[PDB]
C-alpha cells in the first residue's frame, strides 16, 4: 500500500475463553540469500559419508522456510503452567498465520568498510504448499523454529529435501523438485501476505496420569469366581503329580484373569546415570536397539511410547527410548551427561510396559514326564488384541503434529516422538530473496511474522477428594528467576515440562 | 467400498525423511568411555545431525516383517542341501502346518542385489522392490533389540528380531497387483496376494 | 520435624566390621537417599556412601571394598557396615537426608545436599 | 577422590565482609554447579548454608552468598555477626558421582 504506512501491527498474547485457548505469536525475522541463488546436489561424499548407515542424496534449495512447530513458540511458560494443571485434553482448532512489514537490505563494501541501505523495488517470494507437493520437512524435529522468547530476532531455515539413493548415487526413481515451478506471491516493503488454516480432527492429548495401574483394576474385598491352578504336586517324593486349584482373591491378585494387558514393547538398553554403574565399554551404538531398511541401519528413536524405569529406579534411562534436550548455551558436539536433560516417560508406566524390561514370557516346549517346563524372554511384543497404552508426552519444547506418510496402511498414526499425527498438516511456507543481478548484489530481507492457533480445551471433571499434584515453581531463593533472562540478558528454559500431572481412573 | 489401490512408488525413504541440512534439537548418546583403560565410564552426548543421519529420532517406523529365507538364481552360490521343505517359513494350524505363501508384503530384496529372491515370498519370480521404502527386506532381520541389563559386570548383548508383529507408529505398502473372512475381527484386511479385499 | 538417630556399639576393635543404625522418625524412608557421613575428630567431613529404597547403593572409591549400607523400609531404618576396621575408621559418624526433588521432570542421579542431619555417634576403633 | 583445597582459618572484624574460597579440580568442581556450605557450631551437626553454588534454602539471611570462578568457589559472609564463628565446609559433586568435601575453614570473629 506504502513505504510510508505500516501493514501490520503487533500482535502477542492468549485469550483463555472456556473450553478454547487463543494463542498468537508474533516474531521478528531475518532472510538471508541461501547457495546464491543455486539449486544444488548433496550428498554424503561430498563430507565423505564413510558409513552405509549414513548414505543420503539430496538438494538443498535457495528458499527458506517458517517454522513453528515447537510448542515454546505458541506458549508461554505461564500460559503453559494453566494448560497443564487445569486441563485433561487439548488439541489445535485453527491456525492463522501473517507475514508482514517486510525490508530489504542490500549490502555493499564501500572503500573497506560495508553499507547496507532499503532497496524499495526489491521483491521477496513467498508461497505455502496446500497440495502437499513437496516434501514435507518440518515432522523431523528441526532446529529454526520461532524462539520461545518474543524478544528474541531468529534466522530463516534454508529448506532441502532428500531423495532415494543407493550408496550416495541417485537411482532412477529419484526425483527433483524446482520450487519455482509453483505459483507463488512476490511482496514489496508493502505488501503482506497471511492465510488461514484448518487442523483436521485429531483425538485429544492426553495430559493426565492414571492413577491406577492396569493390573490393580480388581475389587480387593471379593474373591473371584473363576479358578487359577495352584499346585502340580502334592509333596518332594516320586510320582507325585497332581492338579490342585484355587480361587483368584485379594491374598494372590497376581493370577487373576483380566480383561486387558498392556501395550506392545520393542526393548531398549538401559543405561544408569551415576557413571561407574554403567559396563567399562564402548557399547553406545554396539549396544543400541535399531531397525534396518534396504539394508540400513537406523537406530530405534524414540521408538515406540514405555515408561522409563521401573518405579524407584530414577538413575535409569533406556539408551535411545527418551527425549533429550540441551540446555541454554549448551555445545553441539561431545558434551557432558549433565550439559542435557533427559526427559522420563514414567506416568505411563501403569499401562505401559518398561522400556528396559522384557514384556514378559512365553513357554517354549512341551512339558512331559521326561522334560521339564521351559519358558523364555519375550524382548518385544507386538500389538495383541486387549492391548491398550498411553502415547508419548508432550513438552514446551517438545513437537506439536507430524505429516503421517502416505502410504497404503498405518497403525495408531500417532507421531513417536509426540504429537498429533495429522494427513494434512499445517503446510509448509515457503520463502526467498528474489535474485537480483551468475553475479548478483548482495542482498538480505527481514520482517515479522505473526501465527495465531485456536486451541481446544477438555475440562477435568474429577471426583478426587485429596489435592492433585500441580506443575509449580517452588519458592527458592536464586540469583535468577526461572524462565526468565540472566543479566547478560540470555533466555533459558531450566527443565523439559511435561503435560501430565492431573489424573484419572484407568 | 474399498481404498484406491496404491499404484506409485514412494521418492523417499521412512528413514531419510528429515531435511538434510539443518540439525534437530534432540541429542544421542555418542560415547560410554573416555578412553582405553580402568574405569573410563563416562556419559557423553551429542546433536543429532545431517553429519550422523543414522541416530536420528524418528516419528514412523517401518512394518512388520516375517523373514523368509534368501535365494539366489545362481545355483552355484546355493547351498548343496535339500532345505526347500525345512528352510522355508511356516505357520501352523490345527497341527497342520502351513507354508507362507506369498506372506505379508515385504521388498523382495535388498537394494544392489537382484539375484536373490524369498523362498516362499515372492508370485512366481515377480520382485517387490519398489516398496522397500517402507517395508523391510524379507529376507533380513528387523533389528535388534538388548536381551539384557548391562553393568560393571555384563557387557551390552542384543539379538535379532526375526520376526515382528504391528507396533504404533508403522507404515507399509501393500502388495502390488479377494473375500475379507467373516470372523469377529482382522487387521488390515487387504489380501496378502495382492488385490482389494472385501466383506462381499 | 524430621528426626535421625544413630545407634550402635562405641567400641570396636580393629579388624572387625563396625555398624550402625540410623532410625528415622517423623518422617517415613519414602523416596529419600539417606547418607553417612563420617567426621574424624579434629578433621574435615568424608562421604561414605548413600542407600535408597530400591536398594541402590552408591559409596566412596576408597571404602568401595569393605563398606556396605542397608535399608530396612519395614523398621523405618538404615543401617552401614564397615569391615576389617582400623584406627583410622575412629570418627563421629551422621546419617543425613538428600534434600527433596521438586520435579520429577529429568532423569539425573543425586546431587548431595543435605536437608537434614542426625546428631552423630562416636565410634572409637581400639585394641 | 582428591578432596577440596580450603583455607585453614579466617578471620574478620563484625561488620565486615568475609570471603572463603575452596579450590576443586575441573571434574569435582571447574565441572559442575553443584557446590554446597555447611557450617558446623561445635558439636552440633553441619546445617546446610548454600547449595547449587549460590543458591540458599529457607531459613538462611541474605548475609550469606557464595559465586564460582573457573575452579575455585567463593563463600561470602556479608556483616558478619558473633553468631556466625563456626566451621565452613565446602561440598562439590564429582565426575563419577561421588561426593567430595573441602577441608574445614574456622572463622573467627575478631573481638
Known amino acids: 500500500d506504502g513505504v510510508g504506512s505500516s501493514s501490520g501491527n503487533w500482535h502477542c498474547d492468549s485469550q483463555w475463553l472456556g473450553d478454547r485457548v487463543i494463542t498468537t505469536s508474533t516474531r521478528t525475522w531475518a532472510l538471508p540469500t541461501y547457495n546464491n541463488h543455486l539449486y544444488k546436489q548433496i550428498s554424503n561424499s561430498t563430507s565423505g559419508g564413510s558409513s552405509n548407515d549414513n548414505a543420503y542424496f539430496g538438494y538443498s534449495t535457495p528458499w527458506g522456510y517458517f517454522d513453528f512447530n515447537r510448542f515454546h513458540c505458541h506458549f508461554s511458560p505461564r500460559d503453559w503452567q494453566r494448560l497443564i494443571n487445569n486441563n485433561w485434553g487439548f488439541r489445535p482448532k485453527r491456525l492463522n498465520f501473517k507475514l508482514f512489514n517486510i525490508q530489504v537490505k542490500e549490502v555493499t563494501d564501500n572503500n573497506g568498510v560495508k553499507t547496507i541501505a532499503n532497496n524499495l523495488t526489491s521483491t521477496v517470494q513467498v508461497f505455502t504448499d496446500s497440495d502437499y507437493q513437496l516434501p514435507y520437512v518440518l515432522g523431523s524435529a528441526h532446529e529454526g523454529c520461532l524462539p520461545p522468547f518474543p524478544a528474541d530476532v531468529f534466522m530463516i531455515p534454508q529448506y532441502g529435501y532428500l531423495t532415494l539413493n543407493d550408496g550416495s548415487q541417485a537411482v532412477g526413481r529419484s526425483s527433483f523438485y524446482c520450487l519455482e515451478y509453483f505459483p507463488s506471491q512476490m511482496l514489496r516493503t508493502g505488501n503482506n501476505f497471511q492465510f488461514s488454516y484448518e487442523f483436521e480432527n485429531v483425538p485429544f492429548h492426553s495430559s493426565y496420569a492414571h492413577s491406577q495401574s492396569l493390573d490393580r483394576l480388581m475389587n480387593p474385598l471379593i474373591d473371584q469366581y473363576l479358578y487359577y491352578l495352584s499346585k502340580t504336586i502334592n509333596g518332594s517324593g516320586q510320582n507325585q503329580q497332581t492338579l490342585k486349584f484355587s480361587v483368584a482373591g485379594p491374598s494372590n491378585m497376581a493370577v487373576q484373569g483380566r480383561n486387558y494387558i498392556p501395550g506392545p514393547s520393542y526393548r531398549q538398553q538401559r543405561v544408569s546415570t551415576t557413571v561407574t554403574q554403567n559396563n567399562n565399554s564402548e557399547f553406545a551404538w554396539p549396544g543400541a536397539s535399531s531397525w534396518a531398511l534396504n539394508g540400513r541401519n537406523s537406530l530405534m528413536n524414540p521408538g515406540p511410547a514405555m515408561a522409563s524405569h521401573k518405579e524407584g529406579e530414577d538413575r535409569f534411562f533406556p539408551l535411545s527410548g527418551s527425549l533429550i534436550f540441551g540446555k541454554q548455551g549448551t555445545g553441539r558436539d561431545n558434551v557432558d551427561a549433565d550439559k542435557v536433560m533427559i526427559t522420563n516417560e514414567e506416568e505411563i508406566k501403569t499401562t505401559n510396559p518398561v522400556a528396559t524390561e522384557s514384556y514378559g514370557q512365553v513357554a517354549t516346549n512341551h512339558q512331559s514326564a521326561q522334560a521339564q517346563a521351559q519358558t523364555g524372554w519375550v524382548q518385544n511384543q507386538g500389538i495383541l488384541p486387549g492391548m491398550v497404552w498411553q502415547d508419548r508426552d508432550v513438552y514446551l519444547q517438545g513437537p506439536i503434529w507430524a505429516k503421517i506418510p502416505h502410504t497404503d496402511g498405518n497403525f495408531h498414526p500417532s507421531p513417536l516422538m509426540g504429537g498429533f499425527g495429522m494427513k494434512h498438516p499445517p503446510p509448509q511456507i515457503l520463502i526467498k530473496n528474489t535474485p537480483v543481478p551468475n553475479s548478483f548484489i548482495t542482498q538480505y530481507s527481514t520482517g515479522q511474522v505473526s501465527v495465531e492457533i485456536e486451541w481446544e480445551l477438555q475440562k477435568e471433571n474429577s471426583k478426587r477428594w485429596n489435592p492433585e499434584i500441580q506443575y509449580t515453581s517452588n519458592y527458592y531463593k536464586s540469583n535468577n528467576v526461572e524462565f526468565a533472562v540472566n543479566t547478560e540478558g540470555v533466555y533459558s528454559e531450566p527443565r523439559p515440562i511435561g503435560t501430565r500431572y492431573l489424573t484419572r481412573n484407568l | 467400498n474399498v481404498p484406491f489401490h496404491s499404484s506409485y512408488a514412494h521418492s523417499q525413504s521412512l528413514d531419510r525423511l528429515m531435511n538434510p541440512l539443518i540439525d534437530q534439537y534432540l541429542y544421542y548418546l555418542s560415547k560410554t568411555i573416555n578412553g582405553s583403560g580402568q574405569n573410563q565410564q563416562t556419559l557423553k552426548f551429542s546433536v543429532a545431525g545431517p553429519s550422523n543421519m543414522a541416530v536420528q529420532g524418528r516419528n514412523y517406523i517401518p512394518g512388520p516383517s516375517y523373514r523368509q529365507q534368501r535365494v539366489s538364481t545362481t545355483v552355484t552360490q546355493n547351498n548343496n542341501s535339500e532345505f526347500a521343505w525345512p528352510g522355508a517359513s511356516s505357520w501352523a494350524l490345527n497341527g497342520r502346518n502351513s507354508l507362507m505363501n506369498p506372506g505379508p508384503a515385504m521388498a523382495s530384496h535388498k537394494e544392489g542385489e537382484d539375484r536373490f529372491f524369498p523362498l516362499s515370498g515372492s508370485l512366481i519370480i515377480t520382485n517387490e522392490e519398489e516398496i522397500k521404502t517402507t517395508n523391510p527386506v524379507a529376507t533380513e532381520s528387523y533389528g535388534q533389540v538388548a536381551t539384557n541389563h548391562q553393568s560393571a559386570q555384563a557387557q551390552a548383548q542384543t539379538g535379532w528380531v526375526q520376526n515382528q508383529g504391528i507396533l504404533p507408529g508403522m507404515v507399509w505398502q501393500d502388495r502390488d497387483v479377494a473375500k475379507i473372512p467373516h470372523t469377529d475381527g482382522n487387521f488390515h484386511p487387504s489380501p496378502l496376494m495382492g488385490g482389494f479385499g472385501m466383506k462381499h | 520435624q524430621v528426626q535421625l538417630q544413630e545407634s550402635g556399639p562405641g567400641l570396636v576393635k580393629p579388624s572387625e566390621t563396625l555398624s550402625l543404625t540410623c532410625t528415622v522418625s517423623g518422617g517415613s524412608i519414602s523416596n529419600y537417599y539417606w547418607n553417612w557421613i563420617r567426621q574424624p575428630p579434629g578433621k574435615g567431613l568424608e562421604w561414605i556412601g548413600y542407600?535408597?529404597?530400591?536398594?541402590?547403593?552408591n559409596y566412596n572409591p576408597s571404602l568401595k571394598s569393605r563398606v556396605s549400607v542397608s535399608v530396612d523400609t519395614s523398621k523405618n531404618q538404615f543401617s552401614l557396615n564397615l569391615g576389617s576396621v582400623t584406627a583410622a575408621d575412629t570418627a563421629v559418624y551422621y546419617c543425613?537426608?538428600?534434600?527433596?526433588?521438586?520435579?520429577?521432570?529429568?532423569?539425573?542421579?543425586?546431587?548431595?545436599?543435605?536437608?537434614?542431619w542426625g546428631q552423630g555417634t562416636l565410634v572409637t576403633v581400639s585394641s | 577422590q582428591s578432596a577440596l583445597t580450603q583455607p585453614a582459618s579466617v578471620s574478620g572484624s563484625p561488620g565486615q565482609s568475609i570471603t572463603i574460597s575452596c579450590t576443586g579440580t575441573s571434574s569435582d568442581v571447574g565441572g559442575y554447579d553443584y557446590v554446597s556450605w555447611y557450617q558446623q557450631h561445635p558439636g552440633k551437626a553441619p546445617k546446610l548454608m548454600i547449595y547449587?553454588?549460590?543458591n540458599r534454602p529457607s531459613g538462611v539471611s541474605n548475609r550469606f552468598s557464595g559465586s564460582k570462578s573457573g575452579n575455585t568457589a567463593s563463600l561470602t559472609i556479608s556483616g558478619l555477626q558473633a553468631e556466625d564463628e563456626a566451621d565452613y565446609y565446602c561440598?562439590?559433586?564429582?565426575?563419577?558421582?561421588?561426593?567430595?568435601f573441602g577441608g574445614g575453614t574456622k572463622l573467627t570473629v575478631l573481638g
Open positions: 547449587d553454588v549460590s
Open positions: 561440598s562439590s559433586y564429582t565426575s563419577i558421582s561421588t561426593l567430595v
Open positions: 542407600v535408597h529404597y530400591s536398594g541402590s547403593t
Open positions: 543425613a537426608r538428600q534434600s527433596r526433588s521438586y520435579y520429577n521432570e529429568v532423569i539425573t542421579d543425586p546431587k548431595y545436599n543435605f536437608d537434614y
